[PDB]
Amino acid sequence: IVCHTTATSPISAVTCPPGENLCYRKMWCDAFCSSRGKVVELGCAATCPSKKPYEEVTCCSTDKCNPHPKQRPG
Amino acid sequence: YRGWKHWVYYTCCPDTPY
């Protein structure tokens, strides 16, 4: 179960590895947010209790959860 | 003065491979 690198980028040398878990992705999204975000962050967690009212982090399991610069504005 | 800002926080303008 393998994330990409993160932030700016397509590539480097990857894996969230020994345990535990999930590619913990912060995404700003001001409200609304209509065409808004352009904010990654991520540096892995052990656990999924990020799920709350004014967050950002949601947990990021399964694969590469990783988007882009969201902005494919489209 | 200033130092300072900066953004954000954007994934804008990748990395690049090339």
Side-chain angles (χ1 to χ4, degrees), chain A residues 24-26 45 47-52 55-59:
Chain A
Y24 189 70
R25 187 244 286 130
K26 259 220 176 79
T47 190
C48 203
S50 186
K51 53 143 176 220
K52 316 171 91 35
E55 289 268 78
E56 261 154 82
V57 267
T58 59
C59 19

Side-chain angles (χ1 to χ4, degrees), chain A residues 7-10 69 71-72, chain B residues 10-16:
Chain A
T8 71
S9 310
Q71 172 172 0
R72 317 292 82 231
Chain B
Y10 18 76
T11 7
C12 167
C13 18
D15 189 59
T16 239

Side-chain angles (χ1 to χ4, degrees), chain A:
Chain A
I1 302 310
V2 157
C3 218
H4 311 161
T5 54
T6 311
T8 71
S9 310
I11 287 181
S12 243
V14 295
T15 84
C16 176
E20 180 92 284
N21 265 37
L22 316 177
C23 199
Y24 189 70
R25 187 244 286 130
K26 259 220 176 79
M27 194 175 91
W28 193 278
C29 218
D30 224 296
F32 264 80
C33 55
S34 61
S35 305
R36 258 103 197 124
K38 67 258 249 290
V39 172
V40 301
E41 232 265 292
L42 69 132
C44 218
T47 190
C48 203
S50 186
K51 53 143 176 220
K52 316 171 91 35
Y54 24 74
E55 289 268 78
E56 261 154 82
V57 267
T58 59
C59 19
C60 241
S61 68
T62 73
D63 307 37
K64 26 93 146 157
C65 197
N66 306 77
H68 286 120
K70 50 97 258 141
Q71 172 172 0
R72 317 292 82 231

Side-chain angles (χ1 to χ4, degrees), chain B residues 1-13:
Chain B
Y1 291 124
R2 293 131 93 138
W4 123 311
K5 274 63 245 72
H6 206 62
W7 278 99
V8 288
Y9 336 128
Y10 18 76
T11 7
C12 167
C13 18

